[PDB]
Amino acid sequence: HRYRPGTVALREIRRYQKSTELLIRKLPFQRLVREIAQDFKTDLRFQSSAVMALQEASEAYLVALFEDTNLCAIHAKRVTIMPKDIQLARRIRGERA
DNA sequence: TTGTTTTTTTCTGGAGACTAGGGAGTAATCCCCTTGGCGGTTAAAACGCGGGGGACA
Numbered sequence: 001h002r003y004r005p006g007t008v009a010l011r012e013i014r015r016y017q018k019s020t021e022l023l024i025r026k027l028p029f030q031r032l033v034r035e036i037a038q039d040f041k042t043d044l045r046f047q048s049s050a051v052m053a054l055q056e057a058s059e060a061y062l063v064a065l066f067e068d069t070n071l072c073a074i075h076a077k078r079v080t081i082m083p084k085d086i087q088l089a090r091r092i093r094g095e096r097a
Numbered sequence: 098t099t100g101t102t103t104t105t106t107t108c109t110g111g112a113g114a115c116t117a118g119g120g121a122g123t124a125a126t127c128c129c130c131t132t133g134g135c136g137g138t139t140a141a142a143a144c145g146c147g148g149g150g151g152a153c154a
Contacts, residue, residue, distance in 0.1 A: 004149070005148080005149055006149085006150080077152095078151085078152080080151085
């Protein structure tokens with residue numbers, strides 16, 4: 001049959017909140033880090049541990065930001081997060097101007 | 098029958114070349130290593146379709 005929209009989303013929320021493994025596949029993230037670093041200094045080498053630490057910090061920060069975004073969206077009587085939500089959360093945080 | 102002497106035998110400066118080996122230099126080969134190709138394995142990001150839900154007024 002068909003699951004009504006919004007139920008499988010709750011199932012994934014339950015699934016991913018019980019687990020800790022990283023949600024971004026490694027190699028694209030590593031290539032993105034390498035590209036970003038290249039603009040600061042050339043012919044650079046990275047320890048896999050450094051790259052893993054970068055991924056852990058980035059994913060945790062993104063999860064916290066998504067939590068704040070969901071809270072902001074709920075405050076607007078809304079269920080869907082939209083860019084203004086991220087913007088407001090970042091603004092109140094003080095990272096974005 | 099013994100010992101002194103005779104005699105025999107053993108011992109006692111310069112030039113013009115050549116080759117051959119050792120240290121340093123170059124480059125090459127075999128083994129290993131890095132990288133790319135062939136062969137297999139498929140979950141999923143994107144795209145489509147259809148329907149439920151809420152954003153906005």
